[PDB]
Amino acid sequence: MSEYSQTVPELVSWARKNDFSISLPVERLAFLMAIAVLNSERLDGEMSEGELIDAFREVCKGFEQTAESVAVRANNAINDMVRQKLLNRFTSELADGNAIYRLTPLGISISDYYIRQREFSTLRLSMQLSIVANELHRAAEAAEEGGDEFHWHRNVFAPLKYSVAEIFDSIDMSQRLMDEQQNFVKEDIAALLNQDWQAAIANCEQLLSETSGTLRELQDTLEAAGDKLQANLLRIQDANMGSGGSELVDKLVFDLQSKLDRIISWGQQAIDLWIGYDRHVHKFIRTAIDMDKNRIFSQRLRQSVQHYFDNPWTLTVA
Amino acid sequence: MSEYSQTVPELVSWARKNDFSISLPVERLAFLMAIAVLNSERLDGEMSEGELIDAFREVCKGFEQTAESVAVRANNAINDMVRQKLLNRFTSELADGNAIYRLTPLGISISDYYIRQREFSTLRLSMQLSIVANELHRAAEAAEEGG
Amino acid sequence: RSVLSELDMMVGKILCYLYLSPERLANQGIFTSQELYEELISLADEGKLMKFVNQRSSGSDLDKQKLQEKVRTTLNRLRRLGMVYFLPNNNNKFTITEAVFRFGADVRSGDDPREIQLRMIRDGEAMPV
DNA sequence: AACGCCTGGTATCTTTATAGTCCTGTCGGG
DNA sequence: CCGACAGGACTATAAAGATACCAGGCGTTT
């Protein structure tokens, strides 16, 4: 069963019928982040209504807002978060009516995107590939040992669905993180070239080399493990075909193979895109540096185009 | 270093200064989900600008909207998603100016919360606990080996 | 008397740098609209310049093609002013002339930009916006 | 016919006003 | 302290208008 059991039109109809929406203003988003932070500092992962109100008061202070009706404003905000599925509320008779609050998977995912400082790591990738390699190897040995539907479900399907698939998703998220990092570096290089292009040449070459080495190191790691992971997926597929199959295991193995191909393909594509940019920046720097030789107008005219909008002027014509 | 290096007042000051916010009405959320579904059916994990516009047209049809300005509305929606950090855009000179799009970790997390039918599996937990037990055991053996 | 548009100035100063560039002198003066466009986006702030084509532009291809068509339009106006000559049989390629140096009137002397600008407006060469 | 320019329309967003909703305060009474 | 009564503030939504952004029409030039 495709993870997304619904076609695009069906999904659109379903979404329209359920009326799902996200609206995160600066103050509410700050309050969510404050709640996420406060929850992370606690031993029980639970927050009382009074503690949430105190957190809202701090946000309001931080926004320099009026102290009037803060208890109401906080209740409105708490009800809005619950109504938006960001917080789960537990009302127990045993708690004398005091409600207990916990953040939902959604409220956490949103708060973590902003607060969690996410940067790409090869050690992490190497570890993840090592674990998945061991999990796939065990699942392949279990598939080759053969067995009943219980053996195939517990020793082959459960590891593939609840362990291998999750690690592949983590690898993909790390790749998507690396993609954001590249776009950030391009913006920094443009800023360095606009401030002082002559002094920025060494810094730009360092940023280009550090990013390139990282992309290549990543790809070398994926390629080394990718062949072993594919061989184990094929061993499982061959063992499944030999033991009369299971459509559930075949579909799951096919999905994992498709993800692995995507994970391997992404690295080569990212390298090609980075190379195009790297060549362009080197060509630009060489053109800026070396082709003006008395070196008189390069600076004189480039700075005028770069900063025109600080003093826009226009010529006159008959 | 605490995963969240900033105290609540510092975070509030920082958030206020960066002016962070998220706006995904039903149509935009549906479009994001449609993009997420379309990306999952592909072999390269990449989407072109024309494919995103076709996806937006289907959402608009599904919302029974006017076919007027759809290419403009789709561009505004695509720019909004990029501006809201949901999509990464790659503009390569090698691609004759054609931009390539990929969903960000954020855009994926949000779409998956709604589309992925997540139900609690005991087997999954048993498996996860097995992997962490092996990873912790290896890390403990490595720590005891010293170095 | 009339004044040129700021987009005309961007294309004018870029055509000026292109004329000077010894790196492209081997072309014997023949340039292509695509090369001009590529040089322009290499130097100016692409996303901030896009604001003039449309107030909502954020890097969409439709907006990038609209920018290219605006450039095609302004370049045709400069051809009428005598600043550039299209090839006899191919309209995607053209040749520069020395008249483009008037776009450098704000920097030909290495002095205070404000004083230069004042001098120019006093002489009737250029107006602000 | 296509490109360039203008005019008006359509979409989007903002502003402005109104009305609601709840809170707060006061007073009186219990 | 409760309960009543109004008044004000705050918040939200509606209404209206403007502004942007494109398209369509029209006019000129290749």
Residue numbers in the entry:
A (entry chain D): 1 to 318
B (entry chain C): 1 to 147
C (entry chain Q): 85 to 213
Sentences from the paper on this structure:
MukBEF folds the chromosome of Escherichia coli and related bacteria. The SMC protein MukB dimerizes at its ‘‘hinge’’ domain, which connects via the long coiled-coil ‘‘arm’’ to the ABC-type ATPase ‘‘head’’ domain. The heads are bridged by the kleisin MukF, whereby the C-terminal winged-helix domain (cWHD) of MukF binds the ‘‘cap’’ surface of one MukB, and the N-terminal middle domain (MD) binds the coiled-coil ‘‘neck’’ of the other MukB. MukF also recruits the dimeric KITE protein MukE.
Focused sub-classification of the particle images revealed a DNA-bound structure. The DNA was captured directly at the open gate, while the proteins adopted a conformation virtually identical to the open-gate state. DNA-binding surfaces were largely contributed by MukE and MukF, and to a lesser extent by the root of the ν-MukB neck. Compared with the apo state, MukE and MukF had aligned their DNA-binding surfaces to enable DNA capture. The DNA was not entrapped inside the complex but bound at its periphery without contacting the top surface of the heads. MukE employed a DNA-binding mode overall similar to its role in DNA clamping; however, the DNA followed a differently bent path along its surface. As the captured DNA is positioned at the open neck gate but not entrapped, we reason that entrapment may be achieved by ingestion through the gate. We propose that the DNA-bound structure obtained here represents this capture state. The capture state, however, requires ATP binding only but not hydrolysis and can thus occur before DNA entrapment. While ATP binding exposes the DNA capture site, ATP hydrolysis triggers closing of the neck gate and ingestion of the captured DNA.
